[PDB]
Coordinates of C-alpha atoms and ligand atoms in Angstrom, one line a residue:
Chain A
X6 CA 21.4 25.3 4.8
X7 CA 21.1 22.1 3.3
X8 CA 18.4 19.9 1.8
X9 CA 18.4 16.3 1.8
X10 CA 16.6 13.8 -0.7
X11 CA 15.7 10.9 -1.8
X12 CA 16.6 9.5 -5.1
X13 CA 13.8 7.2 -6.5
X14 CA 10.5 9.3 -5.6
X15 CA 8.8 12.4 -7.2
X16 CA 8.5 14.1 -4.2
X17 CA 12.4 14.7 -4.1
X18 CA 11.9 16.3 -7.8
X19 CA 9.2 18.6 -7.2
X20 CA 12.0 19.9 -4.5
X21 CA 14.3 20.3 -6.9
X22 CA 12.1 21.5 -9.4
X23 CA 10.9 24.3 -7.2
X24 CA 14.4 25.8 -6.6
X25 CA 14.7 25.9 -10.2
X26 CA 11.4 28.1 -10.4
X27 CA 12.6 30.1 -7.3
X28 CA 15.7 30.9 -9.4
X29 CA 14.2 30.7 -12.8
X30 CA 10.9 33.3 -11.9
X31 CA 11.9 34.9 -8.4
X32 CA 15.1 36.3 -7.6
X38 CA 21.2 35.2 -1.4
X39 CA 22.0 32.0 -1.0
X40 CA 20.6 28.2 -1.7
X41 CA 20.3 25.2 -0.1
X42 CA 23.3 22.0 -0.1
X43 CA 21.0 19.5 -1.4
X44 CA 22.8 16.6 -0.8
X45 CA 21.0 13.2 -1.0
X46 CA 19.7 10.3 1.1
X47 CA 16.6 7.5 2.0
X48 CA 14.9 10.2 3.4
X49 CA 13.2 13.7 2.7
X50 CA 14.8 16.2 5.1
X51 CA 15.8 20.4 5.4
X52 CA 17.9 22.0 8.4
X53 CA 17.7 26.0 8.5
X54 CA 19.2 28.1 11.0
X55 CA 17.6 26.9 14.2
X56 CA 15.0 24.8 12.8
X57 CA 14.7 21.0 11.4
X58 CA 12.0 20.2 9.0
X59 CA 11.1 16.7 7.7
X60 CA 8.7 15.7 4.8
X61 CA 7.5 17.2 1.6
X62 CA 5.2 19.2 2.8
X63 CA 6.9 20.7 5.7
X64 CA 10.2 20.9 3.9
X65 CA 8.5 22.4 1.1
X66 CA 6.9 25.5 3.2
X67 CA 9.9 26.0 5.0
X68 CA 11.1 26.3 1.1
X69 CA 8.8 28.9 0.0
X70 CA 8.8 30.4 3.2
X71 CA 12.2 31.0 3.4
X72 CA 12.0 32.8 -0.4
X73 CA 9.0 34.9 0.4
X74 CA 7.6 32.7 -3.0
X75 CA 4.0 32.3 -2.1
X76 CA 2.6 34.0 -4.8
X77 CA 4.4 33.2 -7.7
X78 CA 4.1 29.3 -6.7
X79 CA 0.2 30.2 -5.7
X80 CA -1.1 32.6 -8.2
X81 CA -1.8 34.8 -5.6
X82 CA -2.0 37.6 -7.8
X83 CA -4.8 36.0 -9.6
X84 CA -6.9 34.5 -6.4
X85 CA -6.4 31.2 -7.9
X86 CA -4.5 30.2 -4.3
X87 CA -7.8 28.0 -3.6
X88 CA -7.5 26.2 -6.7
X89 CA -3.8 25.5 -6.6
X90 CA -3.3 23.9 -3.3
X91 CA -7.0 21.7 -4.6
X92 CA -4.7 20.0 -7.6
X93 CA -1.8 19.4 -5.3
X94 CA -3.5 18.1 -2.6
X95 CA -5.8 15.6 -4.8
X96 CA -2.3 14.7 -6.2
X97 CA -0.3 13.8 -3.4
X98 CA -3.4 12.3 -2.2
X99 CA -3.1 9.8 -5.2
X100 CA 0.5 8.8 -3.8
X101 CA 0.9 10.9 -6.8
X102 CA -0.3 8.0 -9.9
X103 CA -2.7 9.2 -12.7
X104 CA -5.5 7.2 -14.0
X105 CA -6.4 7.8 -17.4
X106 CA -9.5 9.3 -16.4
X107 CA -7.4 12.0 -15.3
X108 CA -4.9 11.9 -18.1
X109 CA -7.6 12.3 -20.4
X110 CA -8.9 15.5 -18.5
X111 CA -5.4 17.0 -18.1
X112 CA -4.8 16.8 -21.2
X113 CA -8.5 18.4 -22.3
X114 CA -7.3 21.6 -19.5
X115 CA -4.2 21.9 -21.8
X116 CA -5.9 22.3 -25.0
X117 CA -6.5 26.0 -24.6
X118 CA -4.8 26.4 -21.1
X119 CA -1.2 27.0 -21.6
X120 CA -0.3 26.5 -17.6
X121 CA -3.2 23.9 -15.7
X122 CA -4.2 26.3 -13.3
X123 CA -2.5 29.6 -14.0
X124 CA -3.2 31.5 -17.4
X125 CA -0.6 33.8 -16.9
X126 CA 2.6 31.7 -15.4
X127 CA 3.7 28.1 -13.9
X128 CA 2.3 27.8 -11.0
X129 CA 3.2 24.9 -8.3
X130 CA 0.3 23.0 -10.2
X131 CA 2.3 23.1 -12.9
X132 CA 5.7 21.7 -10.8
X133 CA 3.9 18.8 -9.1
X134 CA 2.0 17.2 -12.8
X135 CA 5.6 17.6 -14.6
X136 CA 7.3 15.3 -12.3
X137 CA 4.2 12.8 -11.6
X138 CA 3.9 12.2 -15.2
X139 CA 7.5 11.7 -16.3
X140 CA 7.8 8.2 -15.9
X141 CA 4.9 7.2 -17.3
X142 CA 5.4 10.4 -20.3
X143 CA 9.1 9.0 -20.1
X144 CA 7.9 5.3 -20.9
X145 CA 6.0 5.7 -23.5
X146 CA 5.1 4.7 -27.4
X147 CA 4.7 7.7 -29.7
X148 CA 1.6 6.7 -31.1
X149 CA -0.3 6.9 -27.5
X150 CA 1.6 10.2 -26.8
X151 CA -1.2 12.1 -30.0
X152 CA -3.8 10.4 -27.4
X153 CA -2.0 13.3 -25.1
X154 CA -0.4 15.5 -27.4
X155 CA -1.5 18.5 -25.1
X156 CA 0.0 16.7 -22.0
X157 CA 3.1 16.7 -24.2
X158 CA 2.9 20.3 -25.3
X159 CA 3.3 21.7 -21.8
X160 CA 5.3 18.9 -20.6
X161 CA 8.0 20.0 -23.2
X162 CA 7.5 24.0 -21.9
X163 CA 8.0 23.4 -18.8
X164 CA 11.0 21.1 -19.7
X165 CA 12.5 23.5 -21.5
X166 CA 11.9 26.7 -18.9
X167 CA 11.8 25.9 -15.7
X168 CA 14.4 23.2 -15.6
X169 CA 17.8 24.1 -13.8
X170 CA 20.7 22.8 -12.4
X171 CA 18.9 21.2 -9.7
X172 CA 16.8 18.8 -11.7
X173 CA 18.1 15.8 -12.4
X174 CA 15.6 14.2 -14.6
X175 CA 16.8 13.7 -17.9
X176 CA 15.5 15.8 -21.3
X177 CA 12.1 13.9 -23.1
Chain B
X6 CA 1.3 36.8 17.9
X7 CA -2.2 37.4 16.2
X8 CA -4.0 34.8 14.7
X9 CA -6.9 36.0 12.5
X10 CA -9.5 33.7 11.5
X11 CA -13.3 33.8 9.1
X12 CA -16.6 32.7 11.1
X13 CA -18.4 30.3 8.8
X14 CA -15.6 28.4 7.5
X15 CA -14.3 24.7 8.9
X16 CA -10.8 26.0 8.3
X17 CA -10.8 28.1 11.4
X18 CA -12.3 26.1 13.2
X19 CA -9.8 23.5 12.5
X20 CA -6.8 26.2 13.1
X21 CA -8.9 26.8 16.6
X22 CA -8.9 23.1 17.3
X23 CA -5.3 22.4 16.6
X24 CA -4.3 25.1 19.3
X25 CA -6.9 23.5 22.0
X26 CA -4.9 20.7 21.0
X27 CA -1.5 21.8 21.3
X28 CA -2.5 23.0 24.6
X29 CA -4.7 19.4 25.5
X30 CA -1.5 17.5 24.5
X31 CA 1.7 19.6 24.2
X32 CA 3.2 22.3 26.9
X38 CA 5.2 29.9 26.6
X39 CA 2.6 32.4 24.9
X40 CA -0.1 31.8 22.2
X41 CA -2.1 34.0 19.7
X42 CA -4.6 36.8 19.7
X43 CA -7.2 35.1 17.2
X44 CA -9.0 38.1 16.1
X45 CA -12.1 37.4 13.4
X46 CA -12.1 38.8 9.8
X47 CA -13.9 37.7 6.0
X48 CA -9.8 35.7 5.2
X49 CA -7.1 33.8 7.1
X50 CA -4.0 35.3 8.7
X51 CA -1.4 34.6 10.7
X52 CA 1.7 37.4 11.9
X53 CA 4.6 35.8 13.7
X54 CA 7.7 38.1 14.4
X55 CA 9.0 39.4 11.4
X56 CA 6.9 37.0 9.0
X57 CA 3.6 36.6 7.5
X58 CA 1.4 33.6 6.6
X59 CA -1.8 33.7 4.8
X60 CA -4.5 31.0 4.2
X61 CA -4.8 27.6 6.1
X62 CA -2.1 25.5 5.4
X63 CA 0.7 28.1 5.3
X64 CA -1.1 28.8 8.6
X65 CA -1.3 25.5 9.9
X66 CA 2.5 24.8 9.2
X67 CA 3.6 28.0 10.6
X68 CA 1.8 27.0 13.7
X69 CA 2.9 23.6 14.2
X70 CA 6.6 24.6 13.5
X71 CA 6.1 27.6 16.1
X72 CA 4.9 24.8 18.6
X73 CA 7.1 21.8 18.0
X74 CA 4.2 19.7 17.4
X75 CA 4.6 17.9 14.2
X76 CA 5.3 14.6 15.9
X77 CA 2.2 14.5 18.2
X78 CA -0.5 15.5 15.1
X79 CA 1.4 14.0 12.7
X80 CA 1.8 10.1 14.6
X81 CA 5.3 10.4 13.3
X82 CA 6.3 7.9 16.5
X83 CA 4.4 5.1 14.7
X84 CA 5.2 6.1 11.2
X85 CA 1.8 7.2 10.3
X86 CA 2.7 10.6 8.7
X87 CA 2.3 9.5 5.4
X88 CA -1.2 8.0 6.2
X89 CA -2.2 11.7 8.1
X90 CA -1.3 14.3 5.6
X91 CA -2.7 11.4 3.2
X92 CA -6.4 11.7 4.9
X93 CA -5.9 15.5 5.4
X94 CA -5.2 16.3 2.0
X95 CA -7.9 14.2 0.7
X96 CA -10.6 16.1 2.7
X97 CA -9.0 19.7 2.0
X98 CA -9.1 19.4 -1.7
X99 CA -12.9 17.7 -1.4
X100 CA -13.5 21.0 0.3
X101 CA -14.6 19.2 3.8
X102 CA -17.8 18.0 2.2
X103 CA -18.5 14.1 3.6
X104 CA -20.1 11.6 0.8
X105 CA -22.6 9.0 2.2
X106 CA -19.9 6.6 0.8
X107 CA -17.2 7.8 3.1
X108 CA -19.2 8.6 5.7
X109 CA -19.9 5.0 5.8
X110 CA -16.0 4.4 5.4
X111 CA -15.6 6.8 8.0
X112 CA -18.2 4.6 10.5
X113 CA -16.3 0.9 9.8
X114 CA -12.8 2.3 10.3
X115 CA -14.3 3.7 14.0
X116 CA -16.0 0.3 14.9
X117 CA -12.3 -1.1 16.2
X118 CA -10.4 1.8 16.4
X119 CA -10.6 5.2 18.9
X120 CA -9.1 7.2 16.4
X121 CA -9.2 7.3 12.5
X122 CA -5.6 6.8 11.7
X123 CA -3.9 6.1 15.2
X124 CA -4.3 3.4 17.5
X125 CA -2.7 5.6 20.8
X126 CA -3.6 9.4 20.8
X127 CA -5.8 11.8 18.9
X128 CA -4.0 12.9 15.2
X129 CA -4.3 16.0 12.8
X130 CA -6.4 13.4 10.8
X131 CA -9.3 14.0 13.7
X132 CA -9.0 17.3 14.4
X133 CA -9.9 17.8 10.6
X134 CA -12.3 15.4 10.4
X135 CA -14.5 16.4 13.6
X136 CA -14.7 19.8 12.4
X137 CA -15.9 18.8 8.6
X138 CA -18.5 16.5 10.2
X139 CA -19.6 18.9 13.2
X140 CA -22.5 20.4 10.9
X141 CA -23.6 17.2 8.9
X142 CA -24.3 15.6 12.6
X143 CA -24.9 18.6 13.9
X144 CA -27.9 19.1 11.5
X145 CA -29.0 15.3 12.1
X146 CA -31.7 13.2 12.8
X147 CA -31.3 10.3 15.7
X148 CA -32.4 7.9 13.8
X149 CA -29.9 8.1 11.0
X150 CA -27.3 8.7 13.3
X151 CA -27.3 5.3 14.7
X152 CA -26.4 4.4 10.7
X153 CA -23.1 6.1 12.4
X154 CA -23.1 5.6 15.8
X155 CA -19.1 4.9 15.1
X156 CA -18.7 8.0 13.8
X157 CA -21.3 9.3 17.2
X158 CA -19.0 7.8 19.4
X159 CA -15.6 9.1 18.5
X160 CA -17.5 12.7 17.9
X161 CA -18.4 12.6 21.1
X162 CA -14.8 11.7 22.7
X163 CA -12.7 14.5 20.5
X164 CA -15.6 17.1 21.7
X165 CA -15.0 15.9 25.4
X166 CA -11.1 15.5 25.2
X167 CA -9.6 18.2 22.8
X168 CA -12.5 21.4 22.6
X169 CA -10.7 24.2 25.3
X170 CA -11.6 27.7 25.5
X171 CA -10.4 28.4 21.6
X172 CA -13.1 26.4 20.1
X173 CA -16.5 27.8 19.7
X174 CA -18.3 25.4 18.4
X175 CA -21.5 24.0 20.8
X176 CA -21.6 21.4 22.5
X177 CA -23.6 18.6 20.8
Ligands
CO201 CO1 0.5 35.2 -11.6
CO202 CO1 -8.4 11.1 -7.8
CO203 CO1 1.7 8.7 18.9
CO204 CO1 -13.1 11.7 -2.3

């Protein structure tokens, strides 16, 4: 079993990031995670390369559906709909979208979920690190509700497996 | 090995399409593909519900990421980049990328490859299939592009799964 990254994308930490929810919310063993130039995950018999194929084989694997979808609240439909925009995107936000992100989080705790993070909630946190991470404090009360949640999911989720430094 | 699919939806049809294709291109058994109101796949001991877990389940049953994905000339992130455009848009075509859709076709076969059909047309045809389908002559030749390639997917990749008519 073992996972191998890459080290400069967000696609590697929303990996990561997931094992840490698997752990965190769900739950056997876990994966190596050892790292390279290139996304890829080896299990048993099979070979999986990519995100999105290494991260089904992921939740597959862990039976994690939905917890990561909001299954349990039919909000499946509206969870892979943010993702898919996102990694659509080449995962970069516009302040457009900033702006409305951080409107959903005025009276949302979660962005899709009421109830839990939801894989929504693992693919925003590590798209807007960097440009959370660089950033003056005056702007952030532009996006204090972006920084809200950003610090909750910093502060729960987060395991061993991330590597991205504390805000 | 039961596939179970909904009747009005352009996610079955694409989940039909993909097998016509695995069988058009690739290749061993294949699945039922019962009808029902929601999405399902059963495979051996596991369980896959809605498109895209679908869809992955499928391909990795098959083999086939390579051939849908282009992955022999690098294109995989451009497919999954057009795929999961068009999924989160809820397969609904804007006169703006419609247009898009036409230039793109003018010198190329294929929207994202330049040798063989992709996943990026097999989700395509079956989002466009009612907008043409429901369509005027006149306009069409606005997208005779689009008309052409339609026509050369329907000829070259519908088999027996597909149920969609001819046009
Ligand atoms: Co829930
Ligand atoms: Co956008
Ligand atoms: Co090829
Ligand atoms: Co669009």
């Amino acid at each position: 079993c073992v996972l191998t990254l890459v080290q400069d994308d967000v696609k590697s930490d929303i990996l990561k990031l997931v094992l840490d929810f698997i752990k965190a919310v769900v739950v056997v063993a876990f994966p190596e995670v050892r790292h390279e130039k290139k996304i890829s995950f080896q299990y048993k018999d099979k070979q999986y390369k990519e995100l999105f194929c290494t991260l089904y084989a992921i939740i597959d694997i862990y039976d994690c559906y939905n917890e990561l979808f909001n299954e349990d609240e039919g909000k499946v439909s509206e969870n892979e709909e943010f993702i898919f925009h996102l990694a659509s995107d080449k995962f970069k936000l516009k302040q457009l979208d900033m702006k409305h992100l951080n409107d959903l989080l005025c009276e949302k705790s979660y962005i899709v979920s009421n109830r839990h993070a939801s894989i929504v909630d693992i693919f925003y946190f590590c798209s807007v690190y960097k440009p959370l991470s660089e950033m003056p404090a005056k702007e952030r009360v532009e996006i204090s509700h972006i920084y809200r949640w950003f610090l909750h999911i910093q502060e729960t989720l987060v395991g061993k497996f991330t590597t991205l430094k504390k805000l």
